[PDB]
Amino acid sequence: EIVMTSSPATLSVSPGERVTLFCRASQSVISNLAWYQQKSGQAPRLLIYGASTRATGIPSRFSGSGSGTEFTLTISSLQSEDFAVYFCQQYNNWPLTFGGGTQVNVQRTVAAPSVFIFPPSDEQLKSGTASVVCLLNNFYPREAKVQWKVDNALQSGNSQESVTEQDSKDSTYSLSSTLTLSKADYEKHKVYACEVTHQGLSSPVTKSFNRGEC
Amino acid sequence: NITEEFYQSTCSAVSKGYLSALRTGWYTSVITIELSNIKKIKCNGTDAKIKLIKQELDKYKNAVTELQLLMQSTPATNNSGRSLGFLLGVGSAIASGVAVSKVLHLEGEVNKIKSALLSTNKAVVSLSNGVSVLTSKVLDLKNYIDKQLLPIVNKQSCSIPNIETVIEFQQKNNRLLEITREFSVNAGVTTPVSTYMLTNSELLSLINDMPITNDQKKLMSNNVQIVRQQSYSIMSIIKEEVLAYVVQLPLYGVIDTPCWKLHTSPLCTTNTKEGSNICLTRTDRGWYCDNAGSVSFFPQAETCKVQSNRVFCDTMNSLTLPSEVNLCNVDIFNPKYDCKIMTSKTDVSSSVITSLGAIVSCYGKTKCTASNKNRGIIKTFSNGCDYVSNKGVDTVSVGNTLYYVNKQEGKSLYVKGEPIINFYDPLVFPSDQFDASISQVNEKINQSLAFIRKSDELLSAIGGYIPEAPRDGQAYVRKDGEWVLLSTFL
Amino acid sequence: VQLVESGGGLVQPRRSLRLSCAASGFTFDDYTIHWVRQAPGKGLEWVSGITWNSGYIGYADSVKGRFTISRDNARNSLYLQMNSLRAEDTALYYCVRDAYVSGSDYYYYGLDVWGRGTLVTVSSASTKGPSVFPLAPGTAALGCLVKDYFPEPVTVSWNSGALTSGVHTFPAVLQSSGLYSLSSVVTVPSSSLGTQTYICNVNHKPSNTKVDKKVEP
């Protein structure tokens, strides 16, 4: 099968600006290619097909080129409901393939995250597991490094990160990191620390607590 | 814009300012039509509608089988004077397309194509030999047969079709009938390519997705009528419920270079007594285009077709000449390029209508004139080779033949010269040269002057030798040029 | 004009499931239909497809001889069958109509019609209510942690729907235990910490659980 290669990974463009998305194809797909818009939590809408011809309903912001290996989707002035994920597909051969997609996120002034740490629950501590939760609130851009150190030694592999979808009002991601450790290990240590580094912080912000003192 | 220069010296003109669309190569596409394979019509109703449907069905059946007979035989086609044509090479026009046609028969090649067209017509298939080609399906007849006529093949009563379906099927099936008819009289190769073989919409929507310049795309799709005549349709196969034929389409790899059309007419002397005239005509007739630092050359006006200012030519019948051939429109005697000419004794009134005007060769008592649609005859030509512009002229009448001149616009320049026929000595000038050059004529002349030089120098060399003295029975001695008697001295 | 997927569910690994698609509001036979799946927070994968008469059908290399796709055209229905179902087949499964009709007079292309899609999850974990623990406090951030539940989804709303603002409830993450866990937080003015009482409101339909948790310093 021929591989659609979506690109860029993400694309950030401010409201009302041209945005351009790219689709490379493994072997030549000619023109038989289509562009889909997917707003979070619903099916694809079909945007263009034949690479060049917008489907009925699609406004004239959306426009595409094509017939080759390399292809282009172009949104003229990005509007509120155009920030979504875009997918390209060729129909030249079966199997129908797709790209990975290009997220277009609305672009904002850098905003540094607010860090809060939470220690495990008094109740939960009975259960034999301790969940420590570090929160980074309302920042931009999405990329941030959350780091964990128990008694100031660097933890690896026991944490999980989930992240907001960019908020409608303020266009800010927020991020959760959870360090899940055995209650046994949790009493073995005293100082718990979540160390954030982000483009808006002039140096990494670190939040911490001591096992018994809170 | 088009300009023309006439050379009174060489009895020739050049039309300059054109542009070259040069067929350099081919691109093979695979056109297909899906066909339900039906050997048996079993429905016994008798209702005129059913009857007509059955009639069309039989037409379709015989079309299929006709096409199969066509498929068995491997397809082929075949596609002088004062022209240089005899110098041309010889080539196999459809060779490319035929190689693709072969590749299609290869077992399971068809199925690649049938599997490429599932999710949309007009898609790229790469074949077993990895030559990649566009495939377009222009008719789905199998679909209509299924979605529409399937009662009439496999049911006996066999519900009755409405007459609208009769008309519709006749409409749809007709295309197959015509494609078959064409392939039949043409032994499986047609050119130009029909509206039945490719619709304007299909051929443009092919061009658009070929691998070429947007200038090339724009160039074919403006000129579709020409593209057709330079294209072939080759019957290939019918099997596995698909009829498939290859349309090999011209690749124009040289676009917008300068081109000029060289015109030639008999030159000749005016000697008042008949048969005493010597006569010379340039044989470099036809089209020239700049190609890749050289000049190509199309000796045959059939190879070139002229749309407005673009000249579409086929390099297959062409020669590629070093640029210095443009000399002979200036110095025909220039040694850097030896120009080709024919020579003969026959002074006959000829005329040649050029792009912007007319050359006229008026010899003998023949009447040569040029006239305007209003003012009547506006010029009478004397004996010789002359020219007249298309401005203000409509007709050029020579002998009993009345020529009309092209009225397309441009500026025309007459360039005087002495007629080069005058520089030749009638006595040493060969008229037996059919295909010849300037220097080859110089050569037959240098030989026929040479044997004059040798014979005259031998005749003068025996001057210095002494005759026989008298036979009179006296002895003779030599003294200052003569014989004297020996007796004189004794 | 509708395509409605049916029959996704929660299925143990190595075992079998059938998905069906009912068609509405367009003449079904004329179109060829595809099953396209989307893993969660991932891309689109073409699963398989049939065309107008189960004439040609085709599969992804991923599911081959594991999956089977047939149609009725009578019931106006489509069927995909899932066997030796591996654990990465979990995804939202989409019924998708192919706009290229082949032989109508005006051609369209692309995939024009998509169902909401069902949701197939191949996991050996057992359905479990969430354990819900409190996340404790110039403005103050508090929340609650919805831990060890299965399978997704879960909905948190705060103060029984009162506090709607500055409420970020995160994507679930999939713990190494086959069990989901996710946090839901709210930023609130710190002068109301001892004034207003903040109650976390959970809900898990798959377990018929509703947990309300009280959140205090």
Side-chain angles (χ1 to χ4, degrees), chain B residues 398-426:
Chain B
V398 184
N400 297 324
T401 88
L402 181 138
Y403 296 97
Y404 284 71
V405 300
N406 325 83
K407 288 299 270 175
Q408 192 67 293
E409 299 294 347
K411 201 174 175 55
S412 205
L413 182 77
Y414 198 123
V415 172
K416 307 173 83 172
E418 199 200 341
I420 67 180
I421 199 52
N422 287 1
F423 306 177
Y424 282 87
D425 206 323

PDB file of all heavy atoms in Angstrom, chain B residues 398-426:
ATOM      1  N   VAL B 398      -1.226  32.058 -63.063  1.00  0.00           N
ATOM      2  CA  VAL B 398      -0.036  31.645 -63.805  1.00  0.00           C
ATOM      3  C   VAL B 398      -0.451  30.600 -64.833  1.00  0.00           C
ATOM      4  O   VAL B 398      -0.958  29.527 -64.472  1.00  0.00           O
ATOM      5  CB  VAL B 398       1.061  31.071 -62.894  1.00  0.00           C
ATOM      6  CG1 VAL B 398       2.274  30.755 -63.707  1.00  0.00           C
ATOM      7  CG2 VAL B 398       1.408  32.043 -61.795  1.00  0.00           C
ATOM      8  N   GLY B 399      -0.229  30.895 -66.101  1.00  0.00           N
ATOM      9  CA  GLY B 399      -0.763  30.001 -67.108  1.00  0.00           C
ATOM     10  C   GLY B 399      -2.264  29.919 -66.965  1.00  0.00           C
ATOM     11  O   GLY B 399      -2.949  30.941 -66.881  1.00  0.00           O
ATOM     12  N   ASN B 400      -2.796  28.703 -66.925  1.00  0.00           N
ATOM     13  CA  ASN B 400      -4.227  28.535 -66.729  1.00  0.00           C
ATOM     14  C   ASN B 400      -4.621  28.244 -65.284  1.00  0.00           C
ATOM     15  O   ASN B 400      -5.813  28.060 -65.013  1.00  0.00           O
ATOM     16  CB  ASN B 400      -4.772  27.431 -67.638  1.00  0.00           C
ATOM     17  CG  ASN B 400      -4.606  27.755 -69.106  1.00  0.00           C
ATOM     18  OD1 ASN B 400      -4.718  28.913 -69.526  1.00  0.00           O
ATOM     19  ND2 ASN B 400      -4.325  26.730 -69.900  1.00  0.00           N
ATOM     20  N   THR B 401      -3.675  28.194 -64.350  1.00  0.00           N
ATOM     21  CA  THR B 401      -4.022  27.877 -62.974  1.00  0.00           C
ATOM     22  C   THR B 401      -4.146  29.181 -62.190  1.00  0.00           C
ATOM     23  O   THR B 401      -3.275  30.054 -62.281  1.00  0.00           O
ATOM     24  CB  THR B 401      -2.975  26.957 -62.349  1.00  0.00           C
ATOM     25  OG1 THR B 401      -1.947  27.752 -61.770  1.00  0.00           O
ATOM     26  CG2 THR B 401      -2.337  26.069 -63.417  1.00  0.00           C
ATOM     27  N   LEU B 402      -5.245  29.325 -61.449  1.00  0.00           N
ATOM     28  CA  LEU B 402      -5.515  30.516 -60.640  1.00  0.00           C
ATOM     29  C   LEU B 402      -5.340  30.216 -59.157  1.00  0.00           C
ATOM     30  O   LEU B 402      -6.171  29.523 -58.564  1.00  0.00           O
ATOM     31  CB  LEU B 402      -6.919  31.019 -60.935  1.00  0.00           C
ATOM     32  CG  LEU B 402      -7.291  32.270 -60.168  1.00  0.00           C
ATOM     33  CD1 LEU B 402      -8.021  33.256 -61.050  1.00  0.00           C
ATOM     34  CD2 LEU B 402      -8.206  31.866 -59.041  1.00  0.00           C
ATOM     35  N   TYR B 403      -4.282  30.761 -58.550  1.00  0.00           N
ATOM     36  CA  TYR B 403      -3.976  30.513 -57.138  1.00  0.00           C
ATOM     37  C   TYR B 403      -4.556  31.630 -56.263  1.00  0.00           C
ATOM     38  O   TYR B 403      -4.501  32.810 -56.630  1.00  0.00           O
ATOM     39  CB  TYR B 403      -2.456  30.417 -56.904  1.00  0.00           C
ATOM     40  CG  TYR B 403      -1.727  29.259 -57.582  1.00  0.00           C
ATOM     41  CD1 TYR B 403      -1.064  29.434 -58.783  1.00  0.00           C
ATOM     42  CD2 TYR B 403      -1.667  28.005 -56.991  1.00  0.00           C
ATOM     43  CE1 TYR B 403      -0.388  28.383 -59.388  1.00  0.00           C
ATOM     44  CE2 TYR B 403      -1.010  26.944 -57.600  1.00  0.00           C
ATOM     45  CZ  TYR B 403      -0.367  27.139 -58.797  1.00  0.00           C
ATOM     46  OH  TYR B 403       0.300  26.091 -59.409  1.00  0.00           O
ATOM     47  N   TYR B 404      -5.125  31.270 -55.114  1.00  0.00           N
ATOM     48  CA  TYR B 404      -5.446  32.291 -54.120  1.00  0.00           C
ATOM     49  C   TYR B 404      -4.311  32.315 -53.108  1.00  0.00           C
ATOM     50  O   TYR B 404      -3.706  31.277 -52.824  1.00  0.00           O
ATOM     51  CB  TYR B 404      -6.768  32.015 -53.393  1.00  0.00           C
ATOM     52  CG  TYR B 404      -8.059  32.302 -54.149  1.00  0.00           C
ATOM     53  CD1 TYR B 404      -8.453  31.496 -55.202  1.00  0.00           C
ATOM     54  CD2 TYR B 404      -8.936  33.299 -53.742  1.00  0.00           C
ATOM     55  CE1 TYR B 404      -9.651  31.723 -55.882  1.00  0.00           C
ATOM     56  CE2 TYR B 404     -10.144  33.526 -54.425  1.00  0.00           C
ATOM     57  CZ  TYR B 404     -10.486  32.725 -55.495  1.00  0.00           C
ATOM     58  OH  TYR B 404     -11.657  32.886 -56.200  1.00  0.00           O
ATOM     59  N   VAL B 405      -4.000  33.516 -52.585  1.00  0.00           N
ATOM     60  CA  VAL B 405      -2.933  33.678 -51.594  1.00  0.00           C
ATOM     61  C   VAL B 405      -3.553  33.721 -50.208  1.00  0.00           C
ATOM     62  O   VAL B 405      -4.671  34.213 -50.033  1.00  0.00           O
ATOM     63  CB  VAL B 405      -2.077  34.938 -51.837  1.00  0.00           C
ATOM     64  CG1 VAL B 405      -1.433  34.872 -53.177  1.00  0.00           C
ATOM     65  CG2 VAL B 405      -2.922  36.192 -51.712  1.00  0.00           C
ATOM     66  N   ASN B 406      -2.836  33.179 -49.217  1.00  0.00           N
ATOM     67  CA  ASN B 406      -3.282  33.300 -47.832  1.00  0.00           C
ATOM     68  C   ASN B 406      -3.342  34.770 -47.450  1.00  0.00           C
ATOM     69  O   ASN B 406      -2.484  35.560 -47.845  1.00  0.00           O
ATOM     70  CB  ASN B 406      -2.345  32.558 -46.883  1.00  0.00           C
ATOM     71  CG  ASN B 406      -1.792  31.326 -47.496  1.00  0.00           C
ATOM     72  OD1 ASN B 406      -0.824  31.402 -48.221  1.00  0.00           O
ATOM     73  ND2 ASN B 406      -2.414  30.194 -47.255  1.00  0.00           N
ATOM     74  N   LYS B 407      -4.384  35.151 -46.720  1.00  0.00           N
ATOM     75  CA  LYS B 407      -4.527  36.541 -46.331  1.00  0.00           C
ATOM     76  C   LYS B 407      -4.042  36.828 -44.910  1.00  0.00           C
ATOM     77  O   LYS B 407      -4.239  37.947 -44.435  1.00  0.00           O
ATOM     78  CB  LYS B 407      -5.967  37.011 -46.550  1.00  0.00           C
ATOM     79  CG  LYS B 407      -6.314  37.180 -48.056  1.00  0.00           C
ATOM     80  CD  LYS B 407      -5.444  38.245 -48.796  1.00  0.00           C
ATOM     81  CE  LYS B 407      -6.061  39.676 -48.760  1.00  0.00           C
ATOM     82  NZ  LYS B 407      -5.270  40.848 -49.335  1.00  0.00           N
ATOM     83  N   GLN B 408      -3.417  35.868 -44.216  1.00  0.00           N
ATOM     84  CA  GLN B 408      -2.945  36.153 -42.859  1.00  0.00           C
ATOM     85  C   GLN B 408      -1.840  37.209 -42.863  1.00  0.00           C
ATOM     86  O   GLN B 408      -1.021  37.289 -43.780  1.00  0.00           O
ATOM     87  CB  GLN B 408      -2.454  34.891 -42.134  1.00  0.00           C
ATOM     88  CG  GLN B 408      -2.210  35.102 -40.576  1.00  0.00           C
ATOM     89  CD  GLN B 408      -3.495  35.383 -39.700  1.00  0.00           C
ATOM     90  OE1 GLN B 408      -4.148  36.435 -39.821  1.00  0.00           O
ATOM     91  NE2 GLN B 408      -3.808  34.451 -38.788  1.00  0.00           N
ATOM     92  N   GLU B 409      -1.838  38.024 -41.807  1.00  0.00           N
ATOM     93  CA  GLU B 409      -1.129  39.293 -41.745  1.00  0.00           C
ATOM     94  C   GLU B 409       0.351  39.109 -41.425  1.00  0.00           C
ATOM     95  O   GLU B 409       0.772  38.105 -40.845  1.00  0.00           O
ATOM     96  CB  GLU B 409      -1.769  40.210 -40.701  1.00  0.00           C
ATOM     97  CG  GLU B 409      -3.242  40.580 -40.964  1.00  0.00           C
ATOM     98  CD  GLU B 409      -3.462  41.447 -42.220  1.00  0.00           C
ATOM     99  OE1 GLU B 409      -2.478  41.979 -42.783  1.00  0.00           O
ATOM    100  OE2 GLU B 409      -4.636  41.606 -42.635  1.00  0.00           O
ATOM    101  N   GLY B 410       1.135  40.106 -41.821  1.00  0.00           N
ATOM    102  CA  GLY B 410       2.548  40.178 -41.496  1.00  0.00           C
ATOM    103  C   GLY B 410       3.287  41.063 -42.475  1.00  0.00           C
ATOM    104  O   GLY B 410       2.760  41.463 -43.521  1.00  0.00           O
ATOM    105  N   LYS B 411       4.546  41.353 -42.135  1.00  0.00           N
ATOM    106  CA  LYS B 411       5.356  42.252 -42.950  1.00  0.00           C
ATOM    107  C   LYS B 411       6.286  41.456 -43.857  1.00  0.00           C
ATOM    108  O   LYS B 411       6.909  40.467 -43.441  1.00  0.00           O
ATOM    109  CB  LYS B 411       6.163  43.247 -42.104  1.00  0.00           C
ATOM    110  CG  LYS B 411       6.600  44.496 -42.909  1.00  0.00           C
ATOM    111  CD  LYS B 411       7.286  45.558 -42.047  1.00  0.00           C
ATOM    112  CE  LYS B 411       7.809  46.710 -42.897  1.00  0.00           C
ATOM    113  NZ  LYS B 411       6.731  47.307 -43.736  1.00  0.00           N
ATOM    114  N   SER B 412       6.373  41.913 -45.104  1.00  0.00           N
ATOM    115  CA  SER B 412       7.022  41.183 -46.179  1.00  0.00           C
ATOM    116  C   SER B 412       8.112  42.059 -46.784  1.00  0.00           C
ATOM    117  O   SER B 412       7.845  43.199 -47.183  1.00  0.00           O
ATOM    118  CB  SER B 412       5.985  40.778 -47.232  1.00  0.00           C
ATOM    119  OG  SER B 412       6.402  39.636 -47.950  1.00  0.00           O
ATOM    120  N   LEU B 413       9.332  41.527 -46.854  1.00  0.00           N
ATOM    121  CA  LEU B 413      10.497  42.253 -47.344  1.00  0.00           C
ATOM    122  C   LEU B 413      11.082  41.547 -48.563  1.00  0.00           C
ATOM    123  O   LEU B 413      11.454  40.365 -48.483  1.00  0.00           O
ATOM    124  CB  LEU B 413      11.562  42.375 -46.255  1.00  0.00           C
ATOM    125  CG  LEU B 413      12.804  43.169 -46.682  1.00  0.00           C
ATOM    126  CD1 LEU B 413      12.534  44.671 -46.687  1.00  0.00           C
ATOM    127  CD2 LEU B 413      14.014  42.825 -45.822  1.00  0.00           C
ATOM    128  N   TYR B 414      11.176  42.283 -49.676  1.00  0.00           N
ATOM    129  CA  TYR B 414      11.805  41.818 -50.914  1.00  0.00           C
ATOM    130  C   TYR B 414      13.298  42.112 -50.870  1.00  0.00           C
ATOM    131  O   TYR B 414      13.692  43.266 -50.678  1.00  0.00           O
ATOM    132  CB  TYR B 414      11.176  42.528 -52.108  1.00  0.00           C
ATOM    133  CG  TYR B 414      11.392  41.889 -53.462  1.00  0.00           C
ATOM    134  CD1 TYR B 414      10.302  41.530 -54.254  1.00  0.00           C
ATOM    135  CD2 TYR B 414      12.672  41.687 -53.971  1.00  0.00           C
ATOM    136  CE1 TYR B 414      10.469  40.975 -55.505  1.00  0.00           C
ATOM    137  CE2 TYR B 414      12.857  41.127 -55.231  1.00  0.00           C
ATOM    138  CZ  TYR B 414      11.744  40.769 -55.998  1.00  0.00           C
ATOM    139  OH  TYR B 414      11.899  40.198 -57.254  1.00  0.00           O
ATOM    140  N   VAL B 415      14.130  41.091 -51.064  1.00  0.00           N
ATOM    141  CA  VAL B 415      15.581  41.244 -50.984  1.00  0.00           C
ATOM    142  C   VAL B 415      16.181  40.963 -52.360  1.00  0.00           C
ATOM    143  O   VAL B 415      16.328  39.796 -52.762  1.00  0.00           O
ATOM    144  CB  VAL B 415      16.186  40.336 -49.907  1.00  0.00           C
ATOM    145  CG1 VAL B 415      17.677  40.372 -49.970  1.00  0.00           C
ATOM    146  CG2 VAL B 415      15.741  40.813 -48.559  1.00  0.00           C
ATOM    147  N   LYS B 416      16.610  42.028 -53.041  1.00  0.00           N
ATOM    148  CA  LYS B 416      17.114  41.909 -54.401  1.00  0.00           C
ATOM    149  C   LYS B 416      18.407  41.094 -54.417  1.00  0.00           C
ATOM    150  O   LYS B 416      19.035  40.841 -53.388  1.00  0.00           O
ATOM    151  CB  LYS B 416      17.327  43.293 -55.017  1.00  0.00           C
ATOM    152  CG  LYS B 416      16.099  44.184 -54.922  1.00  0.00           C
ATOM    153  CD  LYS B 416      16.342  45.634 -55.381  1.00  0.00           C
ATOM    154  CE  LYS B 416      16.241  45.802 -56.910  1.00  0.00           C
ATOM    155  NZ  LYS B 416      16.285  47.235 -57.360  1.00  0.00           N
ATOM    156  N   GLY B 417      18.758  40.615 -55.596  1.00  0.00           N
ATOM    157  CA  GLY B 417      19.972  39.838 -55.740  1.00  0.00           C
ATOM    158  C   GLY B 417      20.220  39.506 -57.193  1.00  0.00           C
ATOM    159  O   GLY B 417      19.310  39.565 -58.034  1.00  0.00           O
ATOM    160  N   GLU B 418      21.538  39.158 -57.495  1.00  0.00           N
ATOM    161  CA  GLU B 418      21.425  38.752 -58.885  1.00  0.00           C
ATOM    162  C   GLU B 418      21.104  37.262 -58.948  1.00  0.00           C
ATOM    163  O   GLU B 418      21.645  36.478 -58.152  1.00  0.00           O
ATOM    164  CB  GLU B 418      22.712  39.039 -59.647  1.00  0.00           C
ATOM    165  CG  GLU B 418      22.513  39.078 -61.154  1.00  0.00           C
ATOM    166  CD  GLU B 418      23.798  38.874 -61.920  1.00  0.00           C
ATOM    167  OE1 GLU B 418      24.882  39.062 -61.323  1.00  0.00           O
ATOM    168  OE2 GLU B 418      23.727  38.529 -63.119  1.00  0.00           O
ATOM    169  N   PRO B 419      20.208  36.866 -59.852  1.00  0.00           N
ATOM    170  CA  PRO B 419      19.803  35.456 -59.901  1.00  0.00           C
ATOM    171  C   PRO B 419      21.013  34.573 -60.142  1.00  0.00           C
ATOM    172  O   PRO B 419      21.648  34.633 -61.192  1.00  0.00           O
ATOM    173  CB  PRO B 419      18.831  35.414 -61.083  1.00  0.00           C
ATOM    174  CG  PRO B 419      18.282  36.803 -61.166  1.00  0.00           C
ATOM    175  CD  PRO B 419      19.390  37.715 -60.739  1.00  0.00           C
ATOM    176  N   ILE B 420      21.263  33.673 -59.195  1.00  0.00           N
ATOM    177  CA  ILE B 420      22.509  32.936 -59.195  1.00  0.00           C
ATOM    178  C   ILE B 420      22.619  32.036 -60.401  1.00  0.00           C
ATOM    179  O   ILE B 420      23.708  31.552 -60.704  1.00  0.00           O
ATOM    180  CB  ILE B 420      22.651  32.117 -57.896  1.00  0.00           C
ATOM    181  CG1 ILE B 420      21.594  31.016 -57.850  1.00  0.00           C
ATOM    182  CG2 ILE B 420      22.473  33.015 -56.695  1.00  0.00           C
ATOM    183  CD1 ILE B 420      21.666  30.172 -56.619  1.00  0.00           C
ATOM    184  N   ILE B 421      21.512  31.799 -61.107  1.00  0.00           N
ATOM    185  CA  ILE B 421      21.612  31.082 -62.366  1.00  0.00           C
ATOM    186  C   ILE B 421      22.509  31.820 -63.341  1.00  0.00           C
ATOM    187  O   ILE B 421      23.035  31.211 -64.280  1.00  0.00           O
ATOM    188  CB  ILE B 421      20.222  30.848 -62.995  1.00  0.00           C
ATOM    189  CG1 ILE B 421      20.288  29.717 -64.028  1.00  0.00           C
ATOM    190  CG2 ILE B 421      19.695  32.126 -63.634  1.00  0.00           C
ATOM    191  CD1 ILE B 421      20.915  28.455 -63.478  1.00  0.00           C
ATOM    192  N   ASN B 422      22.707  33.127 -63.143  1.00  0.00           N
ATOM    193  CA  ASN B 422      23.498  33.902 -64.090  1.00  0.00           C
ATOM    194  C   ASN B 422      25.000  33.661 -63.950  1.00  0.00           C
ATOM    195  O   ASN B 422      25.725  33.819 -64.940  1.00  0.00           O
ATOM    196  CB  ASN B 422      23.156  35.387 -63.947  1.00  0.00           C
ATOM    197  CG  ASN B 422      21.781  35.719 -64.507  1.00  0.00           C
ATOM    198  OD1 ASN B 422      21.070  34.843 -64.989  1.00  0.00           O
ATOM    199  ND2 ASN B 422      21.396  36.980 -64.427  1.00  0.00           N
ATOM    200  N   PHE B 423      25.472  33.203 -62.786  1.00  0.00           N
ATOM    201  CA  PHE B 423      26.902  33.024 -62.539  1.00  0.00           C
ATOM    202  C   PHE B 423      27.445  31.741 -63.146  1.00  0.00           C
ATOM    203  O   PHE B 423      28.609  31.408 -62.922  1.00  0.00           O
ATOM    204  CB  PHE B 423      27.230  32.999 -61.038  1.00  0.00           C
ATOM    205  CG  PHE B 423      26.721  34.185 -60.251  1.00  0.00           C
ATOM    206  CD1 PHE B 423      26.912  34.223 -58.873  1.00  0.00           C
ATOM    207  CD2 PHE B 423      26.069  35.249 -60.854  1.00  0.00           C
ATOM    208  CE1 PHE B 423      26.457  35.292 -58.107  1.00  0.00           C
ATOM    209  CE2 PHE B 423      25.611  36.322 -60.095  1.00  0.00           C
ATOM    210  CZ  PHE B 423      25.804  36.342 -58.716  1.00  0.00           C
ATOM    211  N   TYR B 424      26.625  30.986 -63.850  1.00  0.00           N
ATOM    212  CA  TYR B 424      27.015  29.686 -64.363  1.00  0.00           C
ATOM    213  C   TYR B 424      27.238  29.774 -65.868  1.00  0.00           C
ATOM    214  O   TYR B 424      26.489  30.453 -66.580  1.00  0.00           O
ATOM    215  CB  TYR B 424      25.938  28.636 -64.009  1.00  0.00           C
ATOM    216  CG  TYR B 424      26.010  28.149 -62.564  1.00  0.00           C
ATOM    217  CD1 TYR B 424      25.356  28.822 -61.528  1.00  0.00           C
ATOM    218  CD2 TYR B 424      26.777  27.041 -62.240  1.00  0.00           C
ATOM    219  CE1 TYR B 424      25.466  28.388 -60.211  1.00  0.00           C
ATOM    220  CE2 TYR B 424      26.884  26.597 -60.938  1.00  0.00           C
ATOM    221  CZ  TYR B 424      26.239  27.266 -59.925  1.00  0.00           C
ATOM    222  OH  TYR B 424      26.391  26.779 -58.637  1.00  0.00           O
ATOM    223  N   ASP B 425      28.283  29.110 -66.346  1.00  0.00           N
ATOM    224  CA  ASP B 425      28.523  29.041 -67.783  1.00  0.00           C
ATOM    225  C   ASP B 425      27.677  27.929 -68.383  1.00  0.00           C
ATOM    226  O   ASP B 425      27.896  26.758 -68.052  1.00  0.00           O
ATOM    227  CB  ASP B 425      30.006  28.793 -68.080  1.00  0.00           C
ATOM    228  CG  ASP B 425      30.449  29.316 -69.476  1.00  0.00           C
ATOM    229  OD1 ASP B 425      29.664  29.221 -70.455  1.00  0.00           O
ATOM    230  OD2 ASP B 425      31.593  29.830 -69.587  1.00  0.00           O
ATOM    231  N   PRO B 426      26.727  28.241 -69.276  1.00  0.00           N
ATOM    232  CA  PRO B 426      25.867  27.195 -69.849  1.00  0.00           C
ATOM    233  C   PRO B 426      26.620  25.983 -70.329  1.00  0.00           C
ATOM    234  O   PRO B 426      26.085  24.868 -70.275  1.00  0.00           O
ATOM    235  CB  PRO B 426      25.176  27.909 -71.021  1.00  0.00           C
ATOM    236  CG  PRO B 426      25.137  29.301 -70.617  1.00  0.00           C
ATOM    237  CD  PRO B 426      26.372  29.572 -69.781  1.00  0.00           C
TER     238      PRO B 426
END
